RNA sequence: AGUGGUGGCCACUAUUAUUGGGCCUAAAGCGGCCGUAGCCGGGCCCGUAAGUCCCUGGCGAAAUCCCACGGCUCAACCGUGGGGCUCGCUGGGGAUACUGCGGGCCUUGGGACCGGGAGAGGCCGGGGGUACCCCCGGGGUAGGGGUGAAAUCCUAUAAUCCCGGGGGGACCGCCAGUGGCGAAGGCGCCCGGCUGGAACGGGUCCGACGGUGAGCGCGGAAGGCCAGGGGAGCGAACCGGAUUAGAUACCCGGGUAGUCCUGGCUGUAAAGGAUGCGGGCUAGGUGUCGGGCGAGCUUCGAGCUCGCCCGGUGCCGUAGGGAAGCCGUUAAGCCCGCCGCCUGGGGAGUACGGCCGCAAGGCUGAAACUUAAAGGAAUUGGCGGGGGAGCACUACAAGGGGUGGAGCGUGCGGU
RNA sequence: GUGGGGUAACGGCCCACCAAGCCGAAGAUCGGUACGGGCCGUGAGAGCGGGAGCCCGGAGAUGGACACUGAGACACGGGUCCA
């Protein structure tokens, strides 16, 4: 069955990418799946995006630049204070400041440097680079 | 179906997205309200009296009207029925499994050596007990009511 | 599938499955049950101290041909009765028959046995409270 | 694939020929769909459409 | 009785069939020592 | 030999949960397992001849004999519930070719017809006491209790005094029987570690702590014992109605003194029931005396 | 001014794997299905703020730890100052994105219903089939059988063999499949009745009603057992005839249980696709099975040919994965849930115990001690009472020559 | 639970009556083992291992049992008994 919409959709992408495709379609489109792909699109390494509705969950399409290597969900919502992200970056990121991390926080889903400029820590979602 | 059979047949059908009730229809509410206890008042199970409207009184779907009664709410074949007390009260479809169980029963009686139709049973058993408990969270049902072989004989 | 549970209200069932499969190994098992000092003739004691019976040479496994000298002592913690390589060109020439002796692990693997010489599993040390090797090198004398 | 599915299933609005009645019908029914006044079947259902026998005017959506 | 498909194999070993017959014997034999 | 009860040793442990009033999955199984059986026999006045079995007796086919799961139950389990109930004198049973015929006694038929809609665990207390003040090997072995007996050889010196009472034409078969049954059985629960099986001291003695004993293992013995309380109110219980006889074993100094020292236990069931169940067994005690004679007697 | 041996602990070891182990072939998926607790769960609106995060009070002693400076020559040690901890707490405020919580709203997952159609899906009644065996009669002598040869074995009241007629148990060939159906084991003569399920066309009706499954339950090849029937053929044991240094075998002639029927038990296997199950992604082509659509053909029955959509089942294979063998939209690739299993090889599926079974046995299961391997894939050669070839007069097919038989010369061995 | 006794004191702590509760497969009960913590060894760290030495707390005086005096003990250099 359907557990998370949210990690399909990125591995979804991810694989997508590998082959280059251009266009690629998410099935089950969310509000949150939307504002955490605005997020990542703030920092350009996915282009123009939008929503079409289908008459039950609605669809998101999006065209790809072919600049990202991987994309993945960090299933377990670790939640993480504003001190240890460095602990946490490099369990998944290459190298400093390589790509983002996605973190709900009071406020909302954005990037995880924008966290730390904020000082607000939250719950670590996903992460690209 | 999948539950049991693992089969990952697609029977499933199509229907658009449109949200208000087609321009070419000619039907108002109202007047299908009458048509819908008119049929129902005949012992018509809400499905197939949905494909009655949909094939030769040629409405595309109930849910497309939006209920006169509540802006909030679109027009269900069932909430009509219970509009005026006819709604069954015991679900129709857990009721067909209920007289299914029945008759499957009285042949297993009739025939001891035809184990598939003991795994049938086992099956069709667990439906209902999957259902059962589904409306008693929902409380669409007495807590206090049970499946019961002898009672499903009643029913 | 996918190494499972990881939910976040599941770590019951992590710890369990982890504990659970600990006990396949075996040295953490040998540690826990203690099973190596209540089968231990030393007592985890690093030497133990013995008086001497016997003297037997031993055939080295193939394709090593060799007789390779040792000795059989009861040891006085508790009465148990060993063997013991003796280490040293000529080296039995100075142990006797009824003397008192000093003894420890051989440094096999696992402890076990060492190389071309099975069973034994131990060496002496002192004799008479006086060190072996000296006396292999004749630097020291026997009492 | 589609990415949105489309209803292949369409409505038409029928002509009965023995007392003209005008109905809309479904291109796939499952039942006999019978007219409403001289009681003659319009349309058969079918494995797939349902073969209809009286005359067509028209198709919907 | 469990197996371990490993043994099965012939490679300088007796076959395992007849291993099983013959501790089953030896399973009835102490057994009925017992009694 | 007279009993190959194999594979349910601790089964029947379980009655001693009746004694308290914490019910559990077992104590329900039983229940519904005994008043099943009992629906199951009829009661036909008639029938002594190896004929009248298979005629005026019910078969029983195991595999028919279902929990209310549509689960099955042990063979073992089935066959531990009606010796008990035989031995309580409340089924007739009899074991012929591979093959178990059975019958409603006397006693049945009337305890379940005045105590029709009484809970189900009043309906097992007040079986096994009926069933224990009429004269039945049970209550001989309450009686041995009684007599400070505790142990298998204590049951054994006794079924042989009352053999050498000569008096015993009442159970003279029932009671060779009992011993038969400690035959075969006192050495795996003495001699022998193993005990893996279960003879009539042992269904007697489970039965028994549905009502007042507790029951220890060791190395396959089944040492007993009886409290004092309850043993006090059901011995009262006893005296109220005078239908048996001692056996010729009394009770001894300590057993006595430890029963009048006590206080007073409340009267298991309600008082109405108890003053029933009284007036019952004294109407009707010669018919039950005749069929019992016949039972477990020989002339 | 320490170096060496032994013994205990961490690393090495991602040989304990949450970060982060694997389970087709190396040990490692339950034979299959069902389902409880547990774990993980569709989308949208409204409200809370338990979890979650930030600020703030109290509190987590000292000793030990990190840093600067100072005193002891320097250091180690000590002091002054600053920071930290097993961190298991707790007061108040703020935030609502997620999770949890209550109310509402909606179909995609899932469920129900209906229309034709397919299929060795199941049970039950009836009818037949060819084949074999027995029995009766009729015909005809002189053998039949069986092996590599033979022999045992049947027959001259007549066999084998041919014709006529009667009875019996088992089974349902070719059509047949690389086909189908079943969750699995399994399922094949014809007809009638009862019954389970799926796929396809229709979202018509329900609104998350779900995946997984510890404990639980069910059915589940052959064989074995229990009680009663049955027993044509075949055939465990057993009895005879052969071969053989040796026959307890392979071959042959017989032959009991069994193999079948009625009721019950036993829970097993190379029950192996050696691959636990659900969802999403990731190039293609090729045929058949089912269903629907589009056609074209049609002596007009989807009957015949093509494309497409789904569903099942193969082959080839792009990318890709792997030690390779090889796998590769029916994934052994990338993510996402849950359960089971494994931690060098023997000892061991053993001992002891528990539970199940009438019994044989079933389910759980050590340790002592011993060992460097055990094992998996795969290259070259070698070898085959394996195969496919082509050569050979130091081979053989065909001819011809001469020893072993007498004696001499002559080398070797035995004395 | 009731009502009481006893205690520096609340409390089944103890006693008389009333009632049958209470815990358990997120594993009681039973057995194995062991003073708990600050800390310490190792590790890049996740982690694993140990709790001797200094400090805090607890417990003990051959095993058990019992008192007197004392604000304070059932008292290592005070007392009584058994082994």
């Not at chain 1, 359907?2 to 280059?20: C, K, Q, Y």
């Not at chain 4, 949105?4 to 038409?12: C, D, G, V």
């Not at chain 6, 004993?213 to 014992?225: F, H, I, N, P, W």
């Given at each position: 069955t359907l557990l998370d919409p949210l990690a399909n959709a990125l591995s979804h992408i991810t694989n997508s990418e590998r082959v280059g495709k251009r266009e690629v379609y998410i099935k089950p489109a969310s509000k949150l799946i939307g504002e955490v792909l605005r997020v990542m699109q703030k920092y350009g390494y996915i282009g123009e995006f939008e929503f079409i509705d289908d008459g039950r969950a609605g669809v998101y399409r999006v065209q790809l630049l072919?600049?990202?290597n991987k994309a993945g969900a960090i299933k377990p919502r670790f939640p993480v204070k504003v001190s240890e992200f460095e602990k946490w970056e490099k369990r998944?990121?290459?190298?400093?400041?390589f790509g983002i991390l996605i973190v709900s926080t009071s406020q909302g889903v954005m990037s995880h440097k924008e966290a730390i400029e904020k000082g607000i820590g939250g719950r670590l979602i996903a992460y690209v680079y | 179906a999948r539950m049991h059979a693992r089969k990952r047949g697609k029977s499933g059908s199509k229907r658009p997205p449109?949200?208000?009730?087609?321009?070419?229809v000619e039907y108002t509410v109202e007047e299908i309200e009458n048509l819908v206890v008119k049929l129902r008042?005949?012992?018509?199970?809400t499905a197939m009296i949905g494909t009655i409207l949909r094939d030769?009184?040629?409405?595309?779907?109930?849910?497309?009207f939006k209920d006169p009664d509540n802006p909030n709410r679109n027009l269900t074949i069932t909430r009509i029925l219970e509009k005026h007390?006819?709604?069954?009260?015991?679900?129709?479809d857990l009721m067909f499994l209920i007289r299914r169980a029945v008759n499957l029963r009285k042949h297993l009686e009739q025939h001891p050596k035809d184990l598939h139709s003991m795994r049938g049973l086992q099956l069709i058993e667990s439906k209902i007990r999957r259902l059962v408990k589904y409306y008693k969270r929902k409380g669409k049902?007495?807590?206090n009511w049970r499946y019961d072989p002898e009672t499903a004989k009643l029913l | 599938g996918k190494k499972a549970p990881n939910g976040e209200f599941a770590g019951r069932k992590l710890k369990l499955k982890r504990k659970k499969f600990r006990?396949?190994?075996?040295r953490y098992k040998r540690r826990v049950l203690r099973l190596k000092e209540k089968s231990d003739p030393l007592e985890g004691a690093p030497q133990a101290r013995g008086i001497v019976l016997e003297k037997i040479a031993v055939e080295a496994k193939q394709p090593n041909s060799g007789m390779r000298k040792a000795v059989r002592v009861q040891l006085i913690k508790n009465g148990k009765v060993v063997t013991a390589f003796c280490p040293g060109?000529?080296?039995?020439?100075?142990i006797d028959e009824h003397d008192e002796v000093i003894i420890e692990g051989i440094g096999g693997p696992k402890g076990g046995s060492?190389?071309?010489?099975?069973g034994i599993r131990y060496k002496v040390v002192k004799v008479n409270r006086v060190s072996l090797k000296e006396l292999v090198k004749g630097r020291k004398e026997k009492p | 694939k589609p990415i949105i599915p489309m209803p292949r299933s369409r409505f038409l609005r029928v002509k009965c020929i023995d007392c003209g009645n005008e109905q809309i019908v479904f291109?796939?029914?499952?039942?006999?769909?019978?007219?409403?006044?001289?009681?003659?079947?319009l349309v058969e259902p079918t494995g797939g459409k349902g073969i209809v026998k009286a005359k067509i005017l028209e198709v919907l959506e | 009785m469990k197996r371990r498909?490993?043994?099965?194999?012939k490679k300088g070993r007796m076959r395992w069939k007849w291993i099983k017959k013959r501790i089953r014997r030896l399973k009835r034999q102490r057994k009925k020592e017992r009694g | 030999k007279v009993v190959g009860i194999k594979?349910?040793?601790?089964?029947?442990?379980?009655?001693?949960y009746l004694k308290t009033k914490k019910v559990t999955k077992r104590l329900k199984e039983i229940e519904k397992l005994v008043d099943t059986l009992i629906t199951l026999?009829?009661?036909?006045?008639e029938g002594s001849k190896i004929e009248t079995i298979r005629k005026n007796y019910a078969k029983i086919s195991?595999?028919?004999?279902?929990?209310?799961?549509r689960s099955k139950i042990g063979s073992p389990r089935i066959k531990s519930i009606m010796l008990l109930l035989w031995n309580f004198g409340l089924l007739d049973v009899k074991i012929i070719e591979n093959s178990w015929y059975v019958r409603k006694t006397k006693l049945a038929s009337l305890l379940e017809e005045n105590f029709?809609?009484?809970?189900p665990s009043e309906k097992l207390k007040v079986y096994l006491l009926g069933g224990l003040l009429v004269d039945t090997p049970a209550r001989f072995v309450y009686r041995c209790t009684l007599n400070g007996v505790e142990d298998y050889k204590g049951v054994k010196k006794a079924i042989l005094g009352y053999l050498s009472d000569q008096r015993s034409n009442s159970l003279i078969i029932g009671l060779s029987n009992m011993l038969e049954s400690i035959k075969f059985i006192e050495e795996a629960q003495a001699?022998?570690?193993?005990?893996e099986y279960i003879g009539l001291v042992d269904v007697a003695f489970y039965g028994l702590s549905g009502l007042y004993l507790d029951v220890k293992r060791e190395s396959g013995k089944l040492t007993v014992k009886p409290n004092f309380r309850e043993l006090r109110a059901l011995y009262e219980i006893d005296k109220s109605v005078?239908?048996?006889?001692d056996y010729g074993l009394s009770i001894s100094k300590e057993i006595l003194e430890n029963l009048a020292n006590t206080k007073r236990r409340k009267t298991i069931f309600s008082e109405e029931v108890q003053e029933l169940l009284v007036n019952v067994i004294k109407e009707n005690a010669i018919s039950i005396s005749q069929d019992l004679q016949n039972m477990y007697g020989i002339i």
């Amino acid at each position: 069955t359907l557990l998370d919409p949210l990690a399909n959709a990125l591995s979804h992408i991810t694989n997508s990418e590998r082959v280059g495709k251009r266009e690629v379609y998410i099935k089950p489109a969310s509000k949150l799946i939307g504002e955490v792909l605005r997020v990542m699109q703030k920092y350009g390494y996915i282009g123009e995006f939008e929503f079409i509705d289908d008459g039950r969950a609605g669809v998101y399409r999006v065209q790809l630049l072919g600049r990202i290597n991987k994309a993945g969900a960090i299933k377990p919502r670790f939640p993480v204070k504003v001190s240890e992200f460095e602990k946490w970056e490099k369990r998944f990121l290459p190298a400093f400041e390589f790509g983002i991390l996605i973190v709900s926080t009071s406020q909302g889903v954005m990037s995880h440097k924008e966290a730390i400029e904020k000082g607000i820590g939250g719950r670590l979602i996903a992460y690209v680079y | 179906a999948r539950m049991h059979a693992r089969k990952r047949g697609k029977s499933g059908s199509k229907r658009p997205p449109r949200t208000a009730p087609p321009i070419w229809v000619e039907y108002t509410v109202e007047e299908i309200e009458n048509l819908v206890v008119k049929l129902r008042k005949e012992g018509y199970s809400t499905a197939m009296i949905g494909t009655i409207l949909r094939d030769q009184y040629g409405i595309p779907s109930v849910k497309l009207f939006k209920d006169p009664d509540n802006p909030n709410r679109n027009l269900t074949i069932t909430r009509i029925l219970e509009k005026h007390g006819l709604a069954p009260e015991i679900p129709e479809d857990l009721m067909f499994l209920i007289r299914r169980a029945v008759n499957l029963r009285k042949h297993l009686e009739q025939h001891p050596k035809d184990l598939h139709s003991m795994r049938g049973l086992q099956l069709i058993e667990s439906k209902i007990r999957r259902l059962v408990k589904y409306y008693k969270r929902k409380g669409k049902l007495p807590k206090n009511w049970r499946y019961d072989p002898e009672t499903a004989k009643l029913l | 599938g996918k190494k499972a549970p990881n939910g976040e209200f599941a770590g019951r069932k992590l710890k369990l499955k982890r504990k659970k499969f600990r006990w396949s190994d075996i040295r953490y098992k040998r540690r826990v049950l203690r099973l190596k000092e209540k089968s231990d003739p030393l007592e985890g004691a690093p030497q133990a101290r013995g008086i001497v019976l016997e003297k037997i040479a031993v055939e080295a496994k193939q394709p090593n041909s060799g007789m390779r000298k040792a000795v059989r002592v009861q040891l006085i913690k508790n009465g148990k009765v060993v063997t013991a390589f003796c280490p040293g060109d000529g080296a039995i020439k100075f142990i006797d028959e009824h003397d008192e002796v000093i003894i420890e692990g051989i440094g096999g693997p696992k402890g076990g046995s060492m190389g071309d010489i099975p069973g034994i599993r131990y060496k002496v040390v002192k004799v008479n409270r006086v060190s072996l090797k000296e006396l292999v090198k004749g630097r020291k004398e026997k009492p | 694939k589609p990415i949105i599915p489309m209803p292949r299933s369409r409505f038409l609005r029928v002509k009965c020929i023995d007392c003209g009645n005008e109905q809309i019908v479904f291109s796939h029914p499952a039942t006999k769909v019978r007219c409403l006044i001289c009681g003659a079947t319009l349309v058969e259902p079918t494995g797939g459409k349902g073969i209809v026998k009286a005359k067509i005017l028209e198709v919907l959506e | 009785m469990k197996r371990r498909p490993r043994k099965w194999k012939k490679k300088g070993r007796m076959r395992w069939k007849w291993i099983k017959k013959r501790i089953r014997r030896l399973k009835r034999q102490r057994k009925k020592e017992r009694g | 030999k007279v009993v190959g009860i194999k594979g349910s040793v601790s089964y029947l442990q379980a009655l001693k949960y009746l004694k308290t009033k914490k019910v559990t999955k077992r104590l329900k199984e039983i229940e519904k397992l005994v008043d099943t059986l009992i629906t199951l026999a009829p009661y036909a006045p008639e029938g002594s001849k190896i004929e009248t079995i298979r005629k005026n007796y019910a078969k029983i086919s195991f595999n028919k004999i279902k929990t209310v799961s549509r689960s099955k139950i042990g063979s073992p389990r089935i066959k531990s519930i009606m010796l008990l109930l035989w031995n309580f004198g409340l089924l007739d049973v009899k074991i012929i070719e591979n093959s178990w015929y059975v019958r409603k006694t006397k006693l049945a038929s009337l305890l379940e017809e005045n105590f029709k809609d009484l809970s189900p665990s009043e309906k097992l207390k007040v079986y096994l006491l009926g069933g224990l003040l009429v004269d039945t090997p049970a209550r001989f072995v309450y009686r041995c209790t009684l007599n400070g007996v505790e142990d298998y050889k204590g049951v054994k010196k006794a079924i042989l005094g009352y053999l050498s009472d000569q008096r015993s034409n009442s159970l003279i078969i029932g009671l060779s029987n009992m011993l038969e049954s400690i035959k075969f059985i006192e050495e795996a629960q003495a001699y022998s570690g193993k005990k893996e099986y279960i003879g009539l001291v042992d269904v007697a003695f489970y039965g028994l702590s549905g009502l007042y004993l507790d029951v220890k293992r060791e190395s396959g013995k089944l040492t007993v014992k009886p409290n004092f309380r309850e043993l006090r109110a059901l011995y009262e219980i006893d005296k109220s109605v005078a239908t048996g006889s001692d056996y010729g074993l009394s009770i001894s100094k300590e057993i006595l003194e430890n029963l009048a020292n006590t206080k007073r236990r409340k009267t298991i069931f309600s008082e109405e029931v108890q003053e029933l169940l009284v007036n019952v067994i004294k109407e009707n005690a010669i018919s039950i005396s005749q069929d019992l004679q016949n039972m477990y007697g020989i002339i």
